[PDB]
C-alpha cells in the first residue's frame, strides 16, 4: 500500500 512514514 501507500507509504505510512515520512
Amino acid at each position, epitope marked *: *500500500g*501507500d*507509504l*505510512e*512514514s*515520512d
Partner: antibody
Framework: QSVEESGGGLVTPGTPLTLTCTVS????????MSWVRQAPGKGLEWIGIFGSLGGIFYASWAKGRFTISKTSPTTVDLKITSPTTEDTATYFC???????????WGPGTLVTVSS | DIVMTQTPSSTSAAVGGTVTITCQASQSVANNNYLKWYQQKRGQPPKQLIYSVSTLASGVPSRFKGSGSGTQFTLTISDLEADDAATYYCSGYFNNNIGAFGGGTKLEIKR
C-alpha cells in the same frame, strides 16, 4: 513536540508487558511512530511502526512477538508477548522521519526480563 | 529478509582525519531516498545526521557528508573532532513499510 516512554522496568519471564509511548505536539493522524530497541551493548533493532494512515507494520522477526496499537490521540502501545531473557533491552519510541529533520526520540526505557 | 549491512564494524582515526562508512541495503529504499544517518552515544538516544540520503540535519556540521547510489550509501566524516567519538547507524525504510538499521559503526578517536 516531545516523546516519552513508560511502563519499563523488571518483568517476570512469560508475563505480558505493555509499554506506552506518549507524545506531545505530534499528530498521530498525520505522522508515524516507530518502536525501536537496543539490547545492552548491541545495535538498534527496529520493532515496528504505527503508520500515518493507521497501518501497523512489524519486522519479520517481531510479528507475533509484539503487538502495536494506538490507545489514545497521544498514546501508542507496544505489548511484548510473553517476554524472554533475550527481550531485555532499552526500548525507544521515536518520530523518526526519513525525509525531514523533525526527528524526536524518547530517552528510552529499560525493560529487564528476569526472575 | 531485509538487511542493512553497515561496514566497518569499528575503525580509528586521528583528529582532523577522515572516516568512511558504507551501508548496503538488500533492496532499494522507499522512494529511493528513505535513508537517514544517526549518531549515538551511550547514555543517550541517537542524534540525526543525514536525511534523504544526503541532506544535512539542522545544526549538524558540514563535515558530515551523505552519499549513495540506490542500494549503497556512504557517510563520510571529514575534519574529525574528539566529539565525533560515538557509534553511527544507518536507518532505512522500505516499500513494504518496513524499517531496518545497520549493525552500527563504533568510531574511536586516536590521540
Amino acid at each position: 513536540q516531545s516523546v516519552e516512554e513508560s511502563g519499563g522496568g523488571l518483568v517476570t519471564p512469560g508475563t505480558p508487558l505493555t509499554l506506552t509511548c506518549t507524545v506531545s505536539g505530534i499528530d498521530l493522524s498525520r505522522y508515524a511512530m516507530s518502536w525501536v530497541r537496543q539490547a545492552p551493548g548491541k545495535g538498534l533493532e527496529w520493532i515496528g511502526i504505527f503508520g500515518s494512515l493507521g497501518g501497523i507494520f512489524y519486522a519479520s522477526w517481531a510479528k507475533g512477538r509484539f503487538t502495536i496499537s494506538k490507545t489514545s490521540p497521544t498514546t501508542v502501545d507496544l505489548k511484548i508477548t510473553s517476554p524472554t531473557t533475550e527481550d531485555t533491552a532499552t526500548y525507544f519510541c521515536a518520530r523518526m522521519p526519513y525525509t525531514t529533520d523533525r526527528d524526536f526520540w524518547g530517552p528510552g526505557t529499560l525493560v529487564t526480563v528476569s526472575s | 529478509d531485509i538487511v542493512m549491512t553497515q561496514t566497518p564494524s569499528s575503525t580509528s582515526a586521528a583528529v582532523g582525519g577522515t572516516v568512511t562508512i558504507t551501508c548496503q541495503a538488500s533492496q532499494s529504499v522507499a522512494n529511493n531516498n528513505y535513508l537517514k544517518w544517526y549518531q549515538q552515544k551511550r547514555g543517550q538516544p541517537p542524534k540525526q545526521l543525514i536525511y534523504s540520503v544526503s541532506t544535512l540535519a539542522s545544526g549538524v556540521p558540514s563535515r558530515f557528508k551523505g552519499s549513495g547510489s540506490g542500494t549503497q550509501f556512504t557517510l563520510t566524516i571529514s575534519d574529525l573532532e574528539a566529539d565525533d567519538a560515538a557509534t553511527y547507524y544507518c536507518s532505512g525504510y522500505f516499500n513494504n513499510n518496513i524499517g531496518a538499521f545497520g549493525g552500527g559503526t563504533k568510531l574511536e578517536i586516536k590521540r
